[PDB]
Design a protein around this ligand. Structure first.
Ligand SMILES: CC(=O)N[C@H]1[C@H](O[C@H]2[C@@H](O)[C@@H](CO)O[C@@H](O[C@H]3[C@H](O)[C@@H](O)[C@H](O)O[C@@H]3CO)[C@@H]2O)O[C@H](CO)[C@@H](O[C@@H]2O[C@H](CO)[C@H](O)[C@H](O)[C@H]2O)[C@@H]1O
Length: 138
């Protein structure tokens, strides 16, 4: 469902991940949270075009890919951390031709260059771990 979906979340993106398709995720990080993940998955393989992994221990926003069975190299640079324990966040994820563009609370968070060139393979949005979702629009 769109409002208050429980975690873990499993959303079927109908007709694949489309260029210009925007995902909105509004949620809350618990005081006790250590980690949660948002994966843009291809179901057949289990490959992940984009794994976004906020980790509260170090306050990192980890981005990586799981392609051909292997983890790529991690991208971590941010200008802000919207995922502090006990915080609400509003994430807007846009799938561009060349990159994902992610904004948190209307402020740019990161861009992630496509590693899976064929982004249309992605038909699975997965959100899992220590996060409470108020709203997910796919
Ligand atoms: C053990 C574990 O946590 N496994 C998770 C897995 O996480 C890995 C992922 O976050 C990558 C991204 O780069 O980092 C891995 O940690 C690395 C450190 O970041 C790095 O500094 C160090 O040098 O090396 C570490 C090891 O590689 C981290 O382990 O993430 C995947 C994707 O979400 C998880 O798979 C999913 O698991 C859920 C249940 O939790 C479901 O079973 C799903 O089917 C599956 O996609 C995995 O559990």
């Amino acid at each position: 469902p769109t409002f208050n979906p429980p975690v873990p979340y499993f959303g079927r993106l109908q007709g694949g991940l489309t260029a210009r398709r925007t995902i909105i995720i509004k949620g809350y990080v618990p005081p006790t949270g250590k980690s949660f993940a948002i994966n843009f998955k291809v179901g057949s393989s289990g490959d992940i075009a984009l794994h976004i992994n906020p980790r509260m221990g170090n306050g990192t926003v980890v981005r990586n890919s799981l392609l051909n069975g292997s983890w790529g190299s991690e991208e971590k640079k941010i200008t802000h951390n919207p995922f502090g324990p006990g915080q609400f966040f509003d994430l807007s994820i846009r799938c561009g031709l060349d990159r994902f563009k992610v904004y948190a609370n209307g402020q740019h968070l990161f861009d992630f260059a496509h590693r899976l060139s064929a982004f249309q393979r992605v038909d699975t949005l997965e959100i899992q771990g220590d996060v409470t979702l108020s709203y997910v629009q796919i």
